[PDB]
Tab-separated table of C-alpha atoms in Angstrom:
chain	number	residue	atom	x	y	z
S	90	UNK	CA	18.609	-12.411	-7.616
S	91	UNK	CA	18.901	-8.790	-8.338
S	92	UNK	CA	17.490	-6.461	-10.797
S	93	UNK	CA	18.003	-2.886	-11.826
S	94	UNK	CA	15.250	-0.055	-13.716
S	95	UNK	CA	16.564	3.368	-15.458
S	96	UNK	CA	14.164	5.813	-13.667
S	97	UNK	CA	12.890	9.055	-16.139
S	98	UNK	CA	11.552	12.487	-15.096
S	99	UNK	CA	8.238	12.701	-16.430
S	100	UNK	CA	9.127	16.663	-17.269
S	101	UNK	CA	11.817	18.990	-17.177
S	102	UNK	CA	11.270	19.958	-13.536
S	103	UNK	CA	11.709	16.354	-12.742
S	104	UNK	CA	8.034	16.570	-10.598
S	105	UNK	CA	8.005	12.899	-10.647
S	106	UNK	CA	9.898	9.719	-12.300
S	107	UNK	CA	8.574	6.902	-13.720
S	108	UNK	CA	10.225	3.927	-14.134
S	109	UNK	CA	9.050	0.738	-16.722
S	110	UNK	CA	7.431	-2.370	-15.279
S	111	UNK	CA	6.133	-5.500	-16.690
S	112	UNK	CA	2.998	-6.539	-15.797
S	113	UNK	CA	1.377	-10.222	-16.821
S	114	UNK	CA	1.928	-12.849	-19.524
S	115	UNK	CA	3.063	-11.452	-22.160
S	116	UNK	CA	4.405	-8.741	-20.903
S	117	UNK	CA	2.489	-5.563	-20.715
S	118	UNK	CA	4.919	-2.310	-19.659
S	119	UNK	CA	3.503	0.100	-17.758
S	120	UNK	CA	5.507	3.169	-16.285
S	121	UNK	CA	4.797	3.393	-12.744
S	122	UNK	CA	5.705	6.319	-10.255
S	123	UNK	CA	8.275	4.116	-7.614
S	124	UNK	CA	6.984	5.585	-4.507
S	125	UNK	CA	8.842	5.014	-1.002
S	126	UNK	CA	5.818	6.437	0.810
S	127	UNK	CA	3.235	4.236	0.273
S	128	UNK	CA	2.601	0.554	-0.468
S	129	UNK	CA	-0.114	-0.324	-3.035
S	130	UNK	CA	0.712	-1.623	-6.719
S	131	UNK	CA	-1.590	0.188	-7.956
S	132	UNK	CA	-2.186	0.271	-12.771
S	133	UNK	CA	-5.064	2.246	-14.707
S	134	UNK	CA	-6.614	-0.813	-16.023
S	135	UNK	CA	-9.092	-1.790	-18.582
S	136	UNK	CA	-12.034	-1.395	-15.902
S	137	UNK	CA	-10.876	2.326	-15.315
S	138	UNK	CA	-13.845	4.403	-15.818
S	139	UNK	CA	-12.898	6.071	-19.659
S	140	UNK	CA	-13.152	9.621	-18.901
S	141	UNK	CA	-10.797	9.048	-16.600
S	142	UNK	CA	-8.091	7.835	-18.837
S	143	UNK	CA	-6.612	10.156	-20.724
S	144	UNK	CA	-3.209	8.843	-22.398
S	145	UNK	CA	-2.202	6.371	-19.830
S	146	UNK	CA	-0.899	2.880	-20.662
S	147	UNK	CA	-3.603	0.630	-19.181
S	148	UNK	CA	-3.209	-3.094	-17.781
S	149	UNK	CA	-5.598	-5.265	-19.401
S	150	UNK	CA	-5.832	-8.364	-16.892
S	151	UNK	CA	-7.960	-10.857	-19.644
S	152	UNK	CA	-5.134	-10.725	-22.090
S	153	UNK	CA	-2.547	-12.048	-19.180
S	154	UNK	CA	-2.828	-15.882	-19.218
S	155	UNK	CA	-1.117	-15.317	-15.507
S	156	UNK	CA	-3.744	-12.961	-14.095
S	157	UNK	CA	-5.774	-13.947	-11.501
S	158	UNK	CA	-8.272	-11.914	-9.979
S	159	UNK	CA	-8.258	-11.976	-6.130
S	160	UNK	CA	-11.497	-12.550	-5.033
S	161	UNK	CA	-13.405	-9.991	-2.602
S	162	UNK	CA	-10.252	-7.947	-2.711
S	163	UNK	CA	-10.600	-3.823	-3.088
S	164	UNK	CA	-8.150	-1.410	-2.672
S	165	UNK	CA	-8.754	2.619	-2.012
S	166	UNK	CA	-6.310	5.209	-1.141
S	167	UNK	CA	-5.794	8.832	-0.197
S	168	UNK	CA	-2.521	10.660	-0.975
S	169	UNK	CA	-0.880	13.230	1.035
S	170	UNK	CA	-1.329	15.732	-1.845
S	171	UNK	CA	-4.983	14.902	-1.432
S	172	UNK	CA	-5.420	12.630	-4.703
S	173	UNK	CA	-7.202	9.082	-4.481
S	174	UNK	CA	-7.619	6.092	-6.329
S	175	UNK	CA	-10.025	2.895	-5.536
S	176	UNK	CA	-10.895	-0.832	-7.346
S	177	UNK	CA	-10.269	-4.653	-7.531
S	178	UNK	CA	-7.184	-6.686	-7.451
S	179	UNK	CA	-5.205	-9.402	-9.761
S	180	UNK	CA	-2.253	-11.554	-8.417
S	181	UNK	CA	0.295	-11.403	-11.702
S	182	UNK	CA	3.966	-12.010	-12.190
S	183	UNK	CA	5.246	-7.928	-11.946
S	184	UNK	CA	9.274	-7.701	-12.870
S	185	UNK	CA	11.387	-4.782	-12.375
S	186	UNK	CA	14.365	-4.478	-14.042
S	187	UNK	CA	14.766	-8.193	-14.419
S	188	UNK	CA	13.542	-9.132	-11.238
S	189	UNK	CA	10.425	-11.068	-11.416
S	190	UNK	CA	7.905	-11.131	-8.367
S	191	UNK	CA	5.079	-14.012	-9.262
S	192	UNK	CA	1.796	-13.729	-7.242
S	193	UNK	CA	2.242	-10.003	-7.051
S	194	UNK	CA	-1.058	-7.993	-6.199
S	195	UNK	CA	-1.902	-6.045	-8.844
S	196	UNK	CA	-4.950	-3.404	-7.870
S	197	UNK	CA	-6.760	-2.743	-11.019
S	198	UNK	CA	-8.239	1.179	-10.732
S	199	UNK	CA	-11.820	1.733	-11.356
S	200	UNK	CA	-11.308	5.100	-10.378
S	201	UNK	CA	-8.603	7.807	-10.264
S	202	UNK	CA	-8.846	11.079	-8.941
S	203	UNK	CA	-8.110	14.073	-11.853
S	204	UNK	CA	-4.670	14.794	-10.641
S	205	UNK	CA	-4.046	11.157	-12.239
S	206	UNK	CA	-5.916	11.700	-15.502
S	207	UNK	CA	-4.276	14.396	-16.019
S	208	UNK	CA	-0.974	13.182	-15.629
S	209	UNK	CA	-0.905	11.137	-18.930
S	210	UNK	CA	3.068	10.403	-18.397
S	211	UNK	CA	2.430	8.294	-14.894
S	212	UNK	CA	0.351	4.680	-15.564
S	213	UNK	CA	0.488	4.211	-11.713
S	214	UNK	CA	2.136	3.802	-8.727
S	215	UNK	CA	4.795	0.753	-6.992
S	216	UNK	CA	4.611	1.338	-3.387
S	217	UNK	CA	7.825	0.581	-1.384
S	218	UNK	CA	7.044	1.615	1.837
S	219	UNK	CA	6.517	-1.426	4.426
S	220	UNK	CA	3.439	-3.411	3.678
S	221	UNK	CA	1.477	-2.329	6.658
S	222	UNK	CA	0.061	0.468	4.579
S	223	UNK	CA	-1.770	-1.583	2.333
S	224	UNK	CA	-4.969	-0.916	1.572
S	225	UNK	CA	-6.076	-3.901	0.261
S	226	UNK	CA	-9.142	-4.911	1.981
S	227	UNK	CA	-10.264	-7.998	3.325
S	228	UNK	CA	-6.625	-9.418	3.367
S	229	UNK	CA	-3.712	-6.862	2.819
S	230	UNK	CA	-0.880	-7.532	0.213
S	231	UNK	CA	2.966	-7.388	0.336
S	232	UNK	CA	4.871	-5.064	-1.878
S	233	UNK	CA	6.845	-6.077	-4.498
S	234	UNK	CA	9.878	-5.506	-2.228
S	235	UNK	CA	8.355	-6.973	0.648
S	236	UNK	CA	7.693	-10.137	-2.094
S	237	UNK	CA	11.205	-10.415	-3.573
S	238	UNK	CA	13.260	-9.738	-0.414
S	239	UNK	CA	13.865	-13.618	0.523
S	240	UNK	CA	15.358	-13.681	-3.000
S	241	UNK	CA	17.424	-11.232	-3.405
S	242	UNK	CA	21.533	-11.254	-2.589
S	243	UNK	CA	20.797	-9.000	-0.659
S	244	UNK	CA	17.311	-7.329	1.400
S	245	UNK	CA	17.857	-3.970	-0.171
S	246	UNK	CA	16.887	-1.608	-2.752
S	247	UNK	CA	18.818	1.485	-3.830
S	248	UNK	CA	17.177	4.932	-5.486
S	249	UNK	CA	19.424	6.923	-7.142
S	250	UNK	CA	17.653	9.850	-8.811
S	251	UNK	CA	19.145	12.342	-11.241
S	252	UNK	CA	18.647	16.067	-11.165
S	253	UNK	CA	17.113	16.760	-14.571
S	254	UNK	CA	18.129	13.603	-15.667
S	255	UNK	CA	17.130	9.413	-15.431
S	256	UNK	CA	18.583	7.553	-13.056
S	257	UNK	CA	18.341	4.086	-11.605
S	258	UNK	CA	16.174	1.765	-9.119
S	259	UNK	CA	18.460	-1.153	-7.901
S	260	UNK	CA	16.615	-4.306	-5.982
S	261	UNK	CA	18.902	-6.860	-4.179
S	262	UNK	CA	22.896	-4.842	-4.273
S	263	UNK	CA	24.565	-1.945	-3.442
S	264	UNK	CA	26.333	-0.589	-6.877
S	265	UNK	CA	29.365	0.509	-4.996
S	266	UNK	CA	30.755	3.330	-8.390
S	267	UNK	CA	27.643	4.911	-7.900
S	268	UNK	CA	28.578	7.486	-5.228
S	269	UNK	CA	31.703	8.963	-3.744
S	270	UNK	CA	33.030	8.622	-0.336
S	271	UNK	CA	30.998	6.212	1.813
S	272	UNK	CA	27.365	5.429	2.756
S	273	UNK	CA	25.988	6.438	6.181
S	274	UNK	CA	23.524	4.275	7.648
S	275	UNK	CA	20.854	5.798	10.160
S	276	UNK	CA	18.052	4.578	12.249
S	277	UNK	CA	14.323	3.683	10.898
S	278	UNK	CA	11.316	3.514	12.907
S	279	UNK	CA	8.777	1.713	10.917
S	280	UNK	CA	5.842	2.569	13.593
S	281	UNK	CA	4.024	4.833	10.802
S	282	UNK	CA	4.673	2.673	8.226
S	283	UNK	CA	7.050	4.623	6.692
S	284	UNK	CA	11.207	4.912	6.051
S	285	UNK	CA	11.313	7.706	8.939
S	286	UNK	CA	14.482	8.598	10.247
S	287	UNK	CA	16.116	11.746	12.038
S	288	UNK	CA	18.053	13.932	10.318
S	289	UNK	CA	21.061	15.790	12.488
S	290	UNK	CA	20.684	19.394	11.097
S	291	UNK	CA	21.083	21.438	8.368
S	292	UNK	CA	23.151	24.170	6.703
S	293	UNK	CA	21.876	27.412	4.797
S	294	UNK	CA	24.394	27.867	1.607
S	295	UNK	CA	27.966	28.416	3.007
S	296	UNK	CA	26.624	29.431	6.351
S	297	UNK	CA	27.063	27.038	9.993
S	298	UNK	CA	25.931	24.306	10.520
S	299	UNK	CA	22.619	23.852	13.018
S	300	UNK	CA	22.711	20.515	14.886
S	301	UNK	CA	18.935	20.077	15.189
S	302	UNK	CA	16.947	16.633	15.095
S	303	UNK	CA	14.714	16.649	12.137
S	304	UNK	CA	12.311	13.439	12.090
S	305	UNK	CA	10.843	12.733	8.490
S	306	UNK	CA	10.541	10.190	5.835
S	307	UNK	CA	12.291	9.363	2.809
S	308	UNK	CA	10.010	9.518	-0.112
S	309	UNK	CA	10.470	8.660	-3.418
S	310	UNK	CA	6.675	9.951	-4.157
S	311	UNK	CA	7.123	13.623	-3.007
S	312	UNK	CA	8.518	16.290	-5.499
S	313	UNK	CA	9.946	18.822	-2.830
S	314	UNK	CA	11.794	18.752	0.647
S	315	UNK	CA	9.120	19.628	3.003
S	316	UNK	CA	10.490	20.483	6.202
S	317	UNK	CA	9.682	22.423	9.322
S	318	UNK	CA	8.424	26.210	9.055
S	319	UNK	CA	11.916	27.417	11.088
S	320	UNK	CA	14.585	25.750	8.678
S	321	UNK	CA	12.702	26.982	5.685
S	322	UNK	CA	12.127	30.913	6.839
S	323	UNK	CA	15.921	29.915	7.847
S	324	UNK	CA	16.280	29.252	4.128
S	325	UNK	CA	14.346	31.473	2.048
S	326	UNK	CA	15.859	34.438	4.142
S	327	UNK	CA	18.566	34.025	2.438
S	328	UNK	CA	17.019	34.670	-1.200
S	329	UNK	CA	16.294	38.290	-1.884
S	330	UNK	CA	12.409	38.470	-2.748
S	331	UNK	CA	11.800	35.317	-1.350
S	332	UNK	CA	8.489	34.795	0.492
S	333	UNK	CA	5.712	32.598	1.555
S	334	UNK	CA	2.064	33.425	-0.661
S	335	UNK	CA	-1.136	32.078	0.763
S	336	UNK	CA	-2.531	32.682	-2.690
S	337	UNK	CA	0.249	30.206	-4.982
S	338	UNK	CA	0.503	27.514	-1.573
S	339	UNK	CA	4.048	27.938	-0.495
S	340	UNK	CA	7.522	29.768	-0.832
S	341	UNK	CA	7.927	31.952	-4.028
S	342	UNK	CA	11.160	33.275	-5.283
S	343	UNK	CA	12.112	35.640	-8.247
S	344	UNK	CA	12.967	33.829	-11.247
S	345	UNK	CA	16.354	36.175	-11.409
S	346	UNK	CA	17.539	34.504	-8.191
S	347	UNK	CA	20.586	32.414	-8.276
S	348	UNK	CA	19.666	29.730	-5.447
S	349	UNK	CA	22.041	28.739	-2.143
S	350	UNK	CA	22.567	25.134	-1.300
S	351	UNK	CA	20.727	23.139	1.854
S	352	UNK	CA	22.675	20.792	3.644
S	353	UNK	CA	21.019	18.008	5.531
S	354	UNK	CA	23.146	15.691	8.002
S	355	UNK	CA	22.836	12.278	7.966
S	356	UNK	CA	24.590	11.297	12.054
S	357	UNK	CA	28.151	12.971	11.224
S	358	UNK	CA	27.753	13.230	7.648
S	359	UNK	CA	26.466	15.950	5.122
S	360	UNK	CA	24.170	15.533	2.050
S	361	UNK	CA	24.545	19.179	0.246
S	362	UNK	CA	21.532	19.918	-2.646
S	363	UNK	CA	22.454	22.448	-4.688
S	364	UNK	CA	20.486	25.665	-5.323
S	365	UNK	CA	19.280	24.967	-8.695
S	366	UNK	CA	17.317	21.231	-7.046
S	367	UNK	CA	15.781	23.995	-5.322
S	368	UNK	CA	13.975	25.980	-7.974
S	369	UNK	CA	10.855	24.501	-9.833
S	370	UNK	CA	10.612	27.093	-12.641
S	371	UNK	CA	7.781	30.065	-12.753
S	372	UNK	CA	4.518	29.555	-11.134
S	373	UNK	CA	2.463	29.468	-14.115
S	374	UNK	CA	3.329	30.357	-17.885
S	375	UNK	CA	5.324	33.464	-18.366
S	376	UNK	CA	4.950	34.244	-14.792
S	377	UNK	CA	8.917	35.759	-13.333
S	378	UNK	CA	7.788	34.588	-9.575
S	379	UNK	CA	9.005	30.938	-9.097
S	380	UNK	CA	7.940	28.164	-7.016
S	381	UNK	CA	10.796	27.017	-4.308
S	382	UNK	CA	11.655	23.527	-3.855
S	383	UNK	CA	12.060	23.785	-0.073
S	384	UNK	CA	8.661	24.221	1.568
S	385	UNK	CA	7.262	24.371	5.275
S	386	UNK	CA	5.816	21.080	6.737
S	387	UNK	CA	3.977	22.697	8.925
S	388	UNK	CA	0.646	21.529	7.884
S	389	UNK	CA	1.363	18.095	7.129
S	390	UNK	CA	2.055	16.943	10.185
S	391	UNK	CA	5.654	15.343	9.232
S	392	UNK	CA	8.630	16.190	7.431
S	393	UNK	CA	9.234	14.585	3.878
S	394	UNK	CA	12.421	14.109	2.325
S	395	UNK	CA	11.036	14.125	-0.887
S	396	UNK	CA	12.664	14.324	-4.103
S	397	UNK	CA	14.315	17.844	-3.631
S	398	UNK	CA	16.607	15.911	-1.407
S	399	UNK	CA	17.194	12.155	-2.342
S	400	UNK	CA	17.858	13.169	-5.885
S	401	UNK	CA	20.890	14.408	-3.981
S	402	UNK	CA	22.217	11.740	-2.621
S	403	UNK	CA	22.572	7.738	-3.394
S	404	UNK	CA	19.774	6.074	-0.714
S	405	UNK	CA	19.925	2.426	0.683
S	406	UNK	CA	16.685	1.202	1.713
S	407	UNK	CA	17.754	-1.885	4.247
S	408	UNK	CA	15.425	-4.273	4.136
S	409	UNK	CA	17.012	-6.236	6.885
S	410	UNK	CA	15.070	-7.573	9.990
S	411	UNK	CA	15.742	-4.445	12.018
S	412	UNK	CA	15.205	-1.380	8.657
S	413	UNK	CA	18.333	1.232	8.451
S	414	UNK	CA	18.712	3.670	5.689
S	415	UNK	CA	22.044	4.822	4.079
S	416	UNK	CA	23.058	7.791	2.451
S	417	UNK	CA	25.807	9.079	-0.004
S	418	UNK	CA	27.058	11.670	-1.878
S	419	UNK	CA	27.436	10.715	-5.179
């Protein structure tokens, strides 16, 4: 089997995509935030506490004659970005794109944290990171991926963002007119959990390349390219005005800048994101400083290839027994 989702920007800054799912019997769509770095299922629900929905699409488990709730089962989890969300848990049939999962865990939120109220565009999240970071508690639960893999024609899936623009979640086969040139395949560790790999360097706009191994994840989840403080001084040197503010959390540029590319190298070959990935508009309203794309890691503790940089490229998650990633221009 395969299947294959259009993926949408929830805004014109492309901070997230969201991608439709179908959820229970009939179908009930929900637009869920595909997310490489983590690996809950996780739908606002009819048992979400109601000032905490505010626009969302909500899964309502009694009208899905497939629904089953899983009993003693909770879920609860902590994002990087310090946002949360806890409840209960359904099995239901969950199809992507025309792939259909039955049996899927479905956690049901009975809370949300306000970053996710106030995102009325995102109805959850579909975790495709490796299903040791479930948080389903007493027994964890597969991802949808980790569920459809034996199934599909192949063990993968593919994300191919678009900058300021939808683009497209494949499950099962490579869609070989999707990028240029060929796909590079590098080494995963899977010993966090995540789809962590080492990147071989980087380039600042037109300038020489650094050979330099940069260990971070890819992440679907993740808006910007957080890397370490060196590269991004490295970068933002290069911008006139540029600097880092305590006050606004990161790199600021002047609105009147015109961007340079970063380069990241993937073993012998080069993924280039041009300046304007880079720049995500003024800081608030009206403001002429603008928030940079390209921010330190520094107090994360890893790197994230977020966004900033996959929206770049055309990414193979390998499935296979031993995990590899690919990457392509496109």
């Amino acid at each position: 089997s395969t299947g294959s989702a259009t993926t949408t920007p929830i805004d014109s800054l492309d901070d997230a995509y969201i991608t439709p799912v179908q959820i229970g019997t009939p179908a009930q769509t929900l637009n869920l935030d595909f997310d490489t770095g983590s690996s809950d299922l996780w739908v606002f629900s009819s048992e979400t506490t109601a000032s905490e929905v505010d626009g969302q699409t909500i899964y309502t488990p009694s009208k899905s004659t497939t629904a089953k709730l899983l009993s003693g089962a909770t879920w609860s989890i902590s994002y990087g970005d310090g946002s949360s969300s806890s409840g209960d848990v359904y099995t239901d049939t969950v199809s992507v794109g025309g792939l259909t999962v039955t049996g899927q865990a479905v956690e049901s939120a009975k809370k949300v944290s306000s970053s996710f109220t106030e995102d009325s565009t995102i109805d959850g999240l579909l975790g495709l990171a490796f299903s040791t970071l479930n948080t389903v508690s007493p027994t964890q639960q597969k991802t949808f991926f980790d569920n459809a893999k034996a199934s599909l024609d192949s063990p993968v899936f593919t994300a191919d963002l678009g900058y300021h623009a939808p683009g497209t979640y494949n499950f099962g086969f490579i869609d070989t007119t999707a990028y240029t040139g060929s796909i590079t395949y590098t080494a995963v560790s899977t010993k966090q959990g995540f789809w962590e790999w080492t990147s071989t360097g980087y380039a600042v706009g037109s300038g020489t390349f650094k050979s330099t191994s940069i260990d971070g994840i890819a992440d679907t989840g993740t808006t910007l390219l957080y890397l370490p403080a060196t590269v991004v001084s490295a970068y933002w040197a290069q911008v006139s005005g540029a600097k880092s503010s305590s006050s606004v959390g990161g790199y600021v540029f002047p609105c009147s800048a015109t961007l340079p590319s970063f380069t990241f190298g993937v073993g012998s070959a080069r993924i280039v994101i041009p300046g304007d990935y880079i720049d995500f508009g003024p800081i608030s309203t009206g403001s002429s400083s603008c928030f940079g794309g390209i921010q330190s890691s520094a107090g994360i503790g890893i790197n994230i290839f977020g966004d900033v940089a996959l929206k770049a490229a055309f990414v193979v998650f390998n499935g296979a027994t031993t995990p590899t990633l690919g990457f392509a221009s496109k």
